Amino acid sequence: APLIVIVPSPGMGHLIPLVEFAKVLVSRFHFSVSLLLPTTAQPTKAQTTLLNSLPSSVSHNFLPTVDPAHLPDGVAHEVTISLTHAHSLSSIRAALGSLAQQAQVVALITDLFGTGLYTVARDLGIPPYLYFTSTAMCLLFLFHLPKLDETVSCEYRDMPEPLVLPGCVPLHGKDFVDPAQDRQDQAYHVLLDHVKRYVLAEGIFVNTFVDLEPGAIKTLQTEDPNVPPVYPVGPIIQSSDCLKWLDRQPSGSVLFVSFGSGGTLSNEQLNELAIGLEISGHRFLWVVRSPNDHSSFGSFFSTQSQDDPFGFLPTGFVDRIKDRGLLVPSWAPQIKVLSHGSTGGFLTHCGWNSTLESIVNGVPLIVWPLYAEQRMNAVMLNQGLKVALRPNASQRGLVEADEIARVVKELMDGDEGKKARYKMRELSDSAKRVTSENGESTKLLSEVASKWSQ
């Protein structure tokens, strides 16, 4: 069985998407997958349990640890990730040498930060590939980032005019990816360094489909012959008290409100959201992430009782919404919620994983972007595809409760919500088509895989 080697960037956040890709490869084709994992620490229980859950065709090997002592403190995560790859490069070469004894290595696939491996792979006669985990629009943006860096002198937020990528919605500088928001930080230079090596990939898989991003994909595929082949092969997505609650609600009636593991809002903003949800009169499932108590000088909290996770919310709020709302602390089974017939909307931070789950389930959005490339995704979903509504922020940047109620009602009962819902269902239909047995996404992946089987 020919062997595909996959090298995820360190951290669960990078492991998960590539593990999903690994599962797709071994389930659809006659391939073995070997995960080589650069690391700065011993496996956690969570990573161990994920890796042990994989089929026998997928093996994994933690590389010799890079000591965090040999890494700079106080740098952005992207820098840490990049340096970890660099320090593991020798190990990966040795592992590839070892694996070549056991099987023929037909391909090497790495995340947007594994680009240092591509030359190494070419020299060993292994075609290297990028599994790109954001939008085609985001990839297009990155391919233009070198030219942008040269011709633009200010911080991108200070740009007078939005950037218009061919076939894409206009994109203001303040909505550029988070690594590019500070040109003075090492993270920015790291992103640039890796982007400049995308051209060395044999091909780039993007977790998207043509009908979703016709413009961006077309540009990527025909604007510049230098850019490697771009393969849209998505959507690829994974796959409990709140589900019991959802079961009891009418069909299409619940606004699911959830930011991710990494997004959190201010107390002031959470309170406007709570009151806005209440006054909308609509049903809602809200995954709440408590704001971390900020301990100013002279302040002393109580260890007497467990923090009520909802203690920060307005007095009487919880009692008032008992008829129509459920508050869930920290985590909910997102896919199950999005696929549940009771769910009629999703207030989301527009992470691509979350977005894709929503698209395949035909759930329209209220967009509330926070970090990474979310603001770019929000503009794409709202202005471009029109499958999302967007509340107007105040001059300060706070979204008021009256505005939140307006947009919740617009999505749930309003005509704009009807329009967004129909467009989202269209995309849901396309998504099901392209990933079917004979679908465009299925066929393309299969076509690329076939050259690995020789």
Side-chain angles (χ1 to χ4, degrees):
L3 181 63
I4 298 167
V5 168
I6 297 171
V7 189
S9 287
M12 202 73 163
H14 293 281
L15 179 64
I16 280 167
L18 269 171
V19 154
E20 221 59 36
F21 191 52
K23 283 158 77 180
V24 163
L25 288 178
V26 298
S27 84
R28 285 183 200 176
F29 316 113
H30 302 123
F31 287 132
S32 286
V33 167
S34 173
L35 291 163
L36 300 180
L37 311 165
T39 192
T40 59
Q42 288 314 294
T44 67
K45 177 268 160 199
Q47 58 210 159
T48 280
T49 60
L50 176 59
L51 290 158
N52 281 353
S53 80
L54 301 185
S56 316
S57 46
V58 185
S59 70
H60 73 269
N61 168 21
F62 281 93
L63 297 160
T65 303
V66 181
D67 197 329
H70 307 141
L71 292 178
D73 290 300
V75 293
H77 287 283
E78 289 84 358
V79 180
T80 302
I81 286 160
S82 189
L83 284 171
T84 307
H85 273 285
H87 276 117
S88 308
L89 190 59
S90 293
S91 292
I92 290 148
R93 176 180 296 273
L96 283 175
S98 283
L99 287 166
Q101 299 308 107
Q102 303 173 215
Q104 327 165 101
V105 178
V106 294
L108 190 133
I109 303 159
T110 88
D111 57 39
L112 78 169
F113 290 125
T115 68
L117 283 172
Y118 293 171
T119 51
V120 170
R122 271 272 159 57
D123 294 346
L124 291 173
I126 302 153
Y129 296 82
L130 171 55
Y131 184 70
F132 192 76
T133 50
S134 289
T135 61
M137 186 186 175
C138 181
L139 180 60
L140 185 56
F141 165 85
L142 289 170
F143 269 119
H144 285 236
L145 185 62
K147 183 75 180 187
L148 257 156
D149 175 65
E150 276 178 20
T151 67
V152 177
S153 43
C154 58
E155 300 288 357
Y156 296 117
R157 66 187 174 270
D158 295 329
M159 278 181 85
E161 299 221 346
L163 161 76
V164 187
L165 302 159
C168 294
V169 292
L171 183 66
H172 301 277
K174 61 180 204 297
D175 293 336
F176 285 8
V177 298
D178 261 13
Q181 279 309 311
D182 176 12
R183 296 180 69 165
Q184 300 301 125
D185 191 284
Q186 190 169 358
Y188 177 63
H189 190 92
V190 168
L191 175 63
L192 269 176
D193 211 38
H194 286 279
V195 161
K196 277 161 180 171
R197 283 189 301 264
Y198 289 178
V199 69
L200 293 175
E202 188 71 5
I204 310 178
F205 302 103
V206 187
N207 193 2
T208 196
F209 64 98
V210 172
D211 284 349
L212 187 55
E213 292 182 85
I217 290 162
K218 180 196 168 67
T219 303
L220 276 167
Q221 288 184 333
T222 79
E223 161 188 56
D224 182 355
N226 207 4
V227 161
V230 170
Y231 308 121
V233 291
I236 293 166
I237 60 153
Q238 316 194 253
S239 293
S240 279
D241 319 273
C242 64
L243 289 171
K244 309 159 147 185
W245 184 88
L246 274 170
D247 287 326
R248 293 195 301 270
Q249 311 311 311
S251 68
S253 72
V254 177
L255 176 69
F256 179 51
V257 179
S258 185
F259 314 90
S261 53
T264 84
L265 293 162
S266 69
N267 274 331
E268 189 196 352
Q269 183 58 96
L270 280 178
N271 276 27
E272 296 296 319
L273 179 53
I275 299 304
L277 284 176
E278 173 187 354
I279 64 184
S280 78
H282 283 284
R283 290 180 163 87
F284 61 94
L285 197 177
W286 181 12
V287 173
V288 181
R289 270 221 193 280
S290 311
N292 224 40
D293 311 328
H294 300 296
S295 302
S296 56
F297 183 46
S299 88
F300 292 99
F301 291 86
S302 161
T303 57
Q304 189 215 340
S305 293
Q306 173 142 19
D307 299 313
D308 182 343
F310 310 135
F312 70 86
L313 284 160
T315 186
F317 166 73
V318 169
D319 299 328
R320 282 187 316 266
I321 56 86
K322 171 73 197 197
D323 69 336
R324 56 199 189 279
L326 179 65
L327 290 199
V328 152
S330 303
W331 171 100
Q334 188 161 284
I335 307 186
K336 298 248 216 157
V337 168
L338 285 174
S339 52
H340 197 295
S342 295
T343 306
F346 181 26
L347 197 160
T348 180
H349 59 209
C350 309
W352 191 236
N353 64 329
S354 291
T355 305
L356 282 178
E357 287 169 2
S358 209
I359 287 161
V360 315
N361 285 288
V363 178
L365 310 178
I366 303 162
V367 290
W368 199 305
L370 300 176
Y371 55 90
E373 83 288 336
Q374 288 160 4
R375 265 204 302 277
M376 178 181 41
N377 296 346
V379 168
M380 184 195 110
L381 294 159
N382 174 238
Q383 273 198 54
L385 288 171
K386 289 136 160 67
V387 297
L389 299 187
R390 162 103 90 153
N392 292 118
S394 87
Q395 305 287 274
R396 205 146 67 72
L398 168 92
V399 188
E400 270 153 316
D402 267 25
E403 176 64 4
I404 289 153
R406 191 196 65 76
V407 181
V408 170
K409 287 196 206 184
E410 258 302 322
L411 182 82
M412 301 324 270
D413 277 341
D415 286 341
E416 296 304 305
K418 213 157 137 66
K419 289 157 60 168
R421 178 164 299 98
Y422 292 143
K423 292 203 174 172
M424 191 59 107
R425 277 176 186 161
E426 256 173 358
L427 289 181
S428 183
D429 289 338
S430 295
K432 195 126 99 68
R433 198 183 322 111
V434 299
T435 55
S436 64
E437 273 299 332
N438 276 47
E440 188 175 20
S441 285
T442 306
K443 270 183 136 64
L444 190 50
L445 181 64
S446 189
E447 171 192 310
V448 180
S450 80
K451 73 176 157 148
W452 299 338
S453 294
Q454 281 113 40

